C-alpha cells in the first residue's frame, strides 16, 4: 500500500465536516469573486479568466515547467482557461481547444482577453474519438475525481493512452494532468512515459487537498516516485494537522485586444 493510496483511503472515511475543513486547508487559491460577477454580466473585455485553470497553468509556466509556443492543442478545454492564458504567450501562433461538454461538464466561454482572436474552442468533441494531430504544445487537463482509486486509476490510464498518440508526434512542450499518480501501476506507467518523452510530475499548490492530481510537464525533470511520494506526504500531513487558512492570491488578469 502506497502513501497516496493511504491518503485516498483516509479521505473516503472523512465525514462531511472533516472533508470540507481539510479540502482547502493550507492551499493556495485565487480570488474569483470579481471574475464571477463580471462574467455573469457578460463582460468579455475586462481581462478576467473564465476559470481558475488559467492561474493553474500560469503557475507552471511562470516557473519554467513549460513554454507554450507554435500551435497549441488544449484537450478537455472546458470553459477554456488554459486556452485563453496560452493565447497571451509570445511564440504561440494559434490555440485549438476541444472539450466533450456533457451534462456535468463545461461548455466553452467566449471572452475577449488578449489573443482571443487566435483561439478556436470547439464543444461536443470527445478526444478519445478524434485522431491525433501534430502540434507544438500539447495541453490536456482531463480526469475526474472519484471516491474509489480504481476509477481514478482507470480514468488516468485512458487519458495517458490517448495522449500517447499525440506525444508520438513529439510536440516540443506538453502539460498533461495525471489525476491518479499514486498507485504502483501508475508510478510504473509514468516512469516508462518519462523515459520515452521526458518531463516530470509537478504538484501545483493551487490544487485542492481532496485530489492527488499532478501535472506531467515537459520542463520538469525530477524522479517520479519521489515526486508522487512527496506530494502524498504533504496531503497526509495536512490531514493530521489543525485547519490552516487558505492562502488567497490575486487572480490572473489577461488583458484585452487582438494579436
Ligand atoms: C468522493 C470524492 F472522492 C471526490 O471524488 C473527491 C474530490 O471532490 P472535490 O470536492 O475535489 O470535487 P471537484 O471535482 O469539484 O474538484 O473528494 C471526495 N469527496 C467529495 N465529497 C466528499 C465528502 O463529503 N466526504 C468524503 N469523505 N469525500 C468526499
Ligand atoms: N473524453 C473527453 N473529451 C473531451 N473533453 C473531456 C473529456 N472528458 C472530460 N473532458 C473535459 O475536460 C475538462 C477538464 S476541466 C479543465 C478546464 C480547463 N483546463 C480550464 O482551464 O478551464 C472538463 O470540462 C471535461 O468536460
Ligand atoms: Mg476533485
Numbering used by the authors: 12 to 270
Q: How does the study describe this entry?
A:
The NS5 protein of members of the genus Orthoflavivirus is composed of two domains: an N-terminal methyltransferase (MTase) domain and a C-terminal RNA-dependent RNA polymerase (RdRp) domain. The orthoflaviviral MTase domain binds to GTP and acts as a guanylyltransferase, and it also binds to S-adenosyl methionine (SAM) and catalyzes the transfer of a methyl group to the N7 position of the pre-cap structure and to the 2′-O position of the penultimate nucleotide of the capped 5′ end. These catalytic activities are important for viral replication, and the MTase domain is therefore a potential target for antiviral drugs. AT-9010 (2'-methyl-2'-fluoro guanosine triphosphate) is a GTP analog whose prodrug, AT-752 is under consideration in human medicine as a potential antiviral drug against certain flaviviruses.
We prepared crystals of Ntaya and Zika virus MTases and soaked them overnight with 10 mM AT-9010. The structures were determined by molecular replacement, and the electron density for both expected ligands, AT-9010 and SAH, was clearly visible. The AT-9010 molecule was in both cases located in the GTP binding site, as expected. In fact, in the case of the Zika virus MTase, we did not observe any density corresponding to the γ-phosphate of AT-9010, and we therefore did not model it. In the Ntaya virus MTase, the amino group of the guanine ring forms hydrogen bonds with the main chains of Leu16 and Leu19, while in the Zika virus MTase, there is an additional interaction with the main chain of residue Asn17. The 3´-hydroxyl group of the modified ribose ring interacts with main chains of Ser151 and Pro152 and the side chain of Lys13 in the Ntaya virus MTase. However, Lys13 adopts a slightly different conformation in the Zika virus MTase, positioning its amino group 4.5 Å away from the 3´-hydroxyl group of the sugar, thereby not allowing the formation of a hydrogen bond. In addition, the Zika virus MTase has a serine residue at position 152, which does not form a hydrogen bond with the sugar ring, whereas the Pro152 in the Ntaya virus protein does. The α-phosphate in the structure of the Zika virus MTase forms a hydrogen bond with residues Lys28 and Ser227, while, in the case of the Ntaya virus MTase, there is arginine residue at position 28, which does not interact with the phosphate group.
